[PDB]
UniProtKB/Swiss-Prot annotation, chain A:
This is one of the proteins that bind and probably mediate the attachment of the 5S RNA into the large ribosomal subunit, where it forms part of the central protuberance. Its 5S rRNA binding is significantly enhanced in the presence of L18. Belongs to the universal ribosomal protein uL5 family. GO terms for biological process: cytoplasmic translation; ribosomal large subunit assembly; translation. The keyword Ribonucleoprotein applies. Keywords: Acetylation, Ribonucleoprotein, Ribosomal protein, RNA-binding, rRNA-binding, tRNA-binding. Coiled coil: none annotated. GO terms for molecular function: 5S rRNA binding; RNA binding; structural constituent of ribosome; tRNA binding. The modification N6-acetyllysine is found at residue 2. It comes from Escherichia coli (strain K12). Part of the 50S ribosomal subunit; part of the 5S rRNA/L5/L18/L25 subcomplex. Contacts the 5S rRNA; cross-links to the P site tRNA. Forms a bridge to the 30S subunit in the 70S ribosome, contacting protein S13 and S19. The gene is rplE. PROSITE patterns: RIBOSOMAL_L5. This is Large ribosomal subunit protein uL5.
Curated annotation (Swiss-Prot), chain B:
It comes from Escherichia coli (strain K12). GO terms for biological process: cytoplasmic translation; negative regulation of cytoplasmic translational initiation; translation; translational initiation. Zn(2+) binds at residue 16. GO terms for molecular function: rRNA binding; structural constituent of ribosome; zinc ion binding. This is Large ribosomal subunit protein bL31. Its cofactor is Zn(2+). HAMAP family: Ribosomal_bL31_1. GO terms for cellular component: cytoplasm; cytosol; cytosolic large ribosomal subunit.
Swiss-Prot record, chain C:
HAMAP family: Ribosomal_uS13. It comes from Escherichia coli (strain K12). GO terms for molecular function: rRNA binding; structural constituent of ribosome; tRNA binding. PROSITE patterns: RIBOSOMAL_S13_1, RIBOSOMAL_S13_2. The keyword DNA-binding does not apply. This is Small ribosomal subunit protein uS13. One of its GO terms (biological process) is cytoplasmic translation. It comes from the Bacteria.
Amino acid sequence: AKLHDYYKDEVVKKLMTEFNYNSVMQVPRVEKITLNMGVGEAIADKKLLDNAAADLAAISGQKPLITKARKSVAGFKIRQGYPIGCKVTLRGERMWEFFERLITIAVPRIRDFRGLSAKSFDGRGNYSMGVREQIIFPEIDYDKVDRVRGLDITITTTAKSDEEGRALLAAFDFPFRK
Amino acid sequence: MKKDIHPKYEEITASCSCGNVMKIRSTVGHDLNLDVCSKCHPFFTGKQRDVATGGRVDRFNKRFNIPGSK
Amino acid sequence: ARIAGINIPDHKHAVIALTSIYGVGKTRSKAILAAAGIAEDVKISELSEGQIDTLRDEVAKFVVEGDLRREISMSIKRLMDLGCYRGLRHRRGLPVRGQRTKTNARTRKGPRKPIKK
RNA sequence: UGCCUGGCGGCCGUAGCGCGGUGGUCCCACCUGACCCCAUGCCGAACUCAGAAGUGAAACGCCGUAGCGCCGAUGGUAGUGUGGGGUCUCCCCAUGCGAGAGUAGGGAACUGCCAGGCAU
RNA sequence: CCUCCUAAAGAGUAACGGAGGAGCACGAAGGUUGGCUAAUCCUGGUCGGACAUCAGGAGGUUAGUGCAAUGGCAUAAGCCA
RNA sequence: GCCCGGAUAGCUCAGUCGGUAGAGCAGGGGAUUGAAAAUCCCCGUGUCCUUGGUUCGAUUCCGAGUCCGGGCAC
RNA sequence: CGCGGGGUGGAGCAGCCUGGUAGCUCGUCGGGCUCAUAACCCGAAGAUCGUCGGUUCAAAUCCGGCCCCCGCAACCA
RNA sequence: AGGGCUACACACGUGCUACAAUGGCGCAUACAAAGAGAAGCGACCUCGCGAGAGCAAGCGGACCUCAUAAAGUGCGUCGUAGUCCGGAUUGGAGUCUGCAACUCGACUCCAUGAAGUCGGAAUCGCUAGUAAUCGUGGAUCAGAAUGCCACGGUGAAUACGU
């Protein structure tokens, strides 16, 4: 709800006024949020990636893709073509609704702030909050005494520098141990 | 947004204004602001003299008149 | 999980339940219940959210695992960076309260290793 | 008649790249919305459909700039045909052919077609 | 029996000359429509921080090619439906 | 490429005329001795190979094909 | 010359056939029994597969070079 | 005077506490012996979470004091989950004895909270007020006791036979 409505009126004027952009539309915008568990654990057992997707879906708000391996050699020699990761990808209303369940709920329910002290960005203006465990789930009876697994929160922006890019995000207010 | 990717999005959209009582808000959690150490220990606390917890009744100088007929 | 503080189970009694927080033991848990006006042997599932919040206001008053574990780290670290004898034993993984180091002490010297001959 | 924008070319780096400037109620991008036919191994990003305001920002067209890519003489040099010599593992002589590299210099494109706007 | 060199800028031509492979696979790994584009490194990244999955950038195929080498290919002869 | 004949406890075999899952030895525990070698004990496992079919029900009874082992073929 | 086999924990042997897997008996070290040693019992440790490279996602293993050990061969007038 | 014997890679003997439900936790409740004490032990009193504090009676030993006997009994509670088991560790605050508790004290409390699911080979003590188990006192001793020395509570298996 409120995030895209807030970005529209406030974050576009704020960034325009602080950075004096050449034309208003050149304010940085929010480009897709991709989430992603990655493997978690356990290639071999080959059940758990299908359980990982069914956990991830609830807080994604869409089915996970189930990414499979490229040529691979890391913590095991995965070869190529095995199932491995998870992957989501959001934009528009789905992302703006998501970005409100982040920030409002999920971040204040992380106890020690592994989710954000100081954290730094890519080479241009994209960022990646690797959350440690389990956040919140839809209506009721959230906990089923599961098997942990955090996830990458890779949020993306159209922005030209990481110094500029953190004026964005911060205009929606960003963490209390930051 | 194909039809069969089943979000729970009616529930996830629903119940949307949550209180400070109901689910804490983002108006709670910066409140204990900073991580605080004070290195001016006891005995740096202006205490150059010390005394125990309690027993503070009847304080005067009496030089060991405590035995009952020794 | 996130009941009063972030670390609590259900169907435990309220004296037991808060113990799992870190910074509230058996004595503080009793005293937190006394403070809140709550009976001890109540199932923690039984309490409603405004009662649970009343516990949560007192639970926040002390110290809890995000704040505690940073504090006890900072206390130890101040000794290790200072380099006093206390801190040196704390650095070295041998006993710091002066215990007999000749025979026992396999809490600090851990799981056994061979003679490495 | 000219200037500018778009499609299909011809030739296919002197045509490229960099760097800077610059253009938007023709037009083109981006653009918003996704209702609906349509569509995603999740994702309206892509594809597709329906369209107002917005912006020239990114893309791209245009201009300037030689930093780089690139073209490049003449002469000499190598090599070789044929015929001849000798100190013959190789080189000379006759005369036909004659590079590659490198130097001067050129260099930021020329041009046909139909299509729209603006000025004349 | 195949590929490269010797092989002399058309034919490719010997030597117990130099160097490598094949004796099959495939019912899709064939047909056709439709879409898409590589190795590698960096930077950010919840434990593979030497190497999974992710996102961003540079690069511009340095990759791919059922299997050898040579030729080949982006309109793809590659990869997917 | 035929006719044969087998495919189970881990093994060989087999209670298995269709009404119904075993002997011999293999690994663990208990019970005794200069631990042992060695007694005695209680569990050891199968949709009888994959598919057809007779039937009140049948693996085997009647059948088609894969693999092993034995003959004649070429 | 030439051809083929071999190079494993301190010892002797196994695994080596397009491959991911370290096993046995001795010896060793710690504990035990014994007056004490022997033996006997229990536990543990020990090989980055001669060496260098190559192919491979992965190599002790397959491939190539060198050193080292063995078997056979090095004639015919 | 300060340091040391009280270190640590590790190996061993001896003992404690434990791994739980015959129990741990809570609250209420029962009945001992033996001993020490004028360098000492110290009620009652009011204060302290408590260790302790101060104020102060008393005692020369059947008198006063150390000294609330514990396990047991009552009732509630927990549910085989390394836990309401276990408490090792370490932080922090605190008390006392003493010149001083850093090396090198004891104890209180708050918090935290490991190994541990009854132990391989081996192996020891005991015949009945015994073993097992529960507490109490004392010597030394300013201050350090799981040790040693003693006291009493509850109280067993079985010994055919050589």
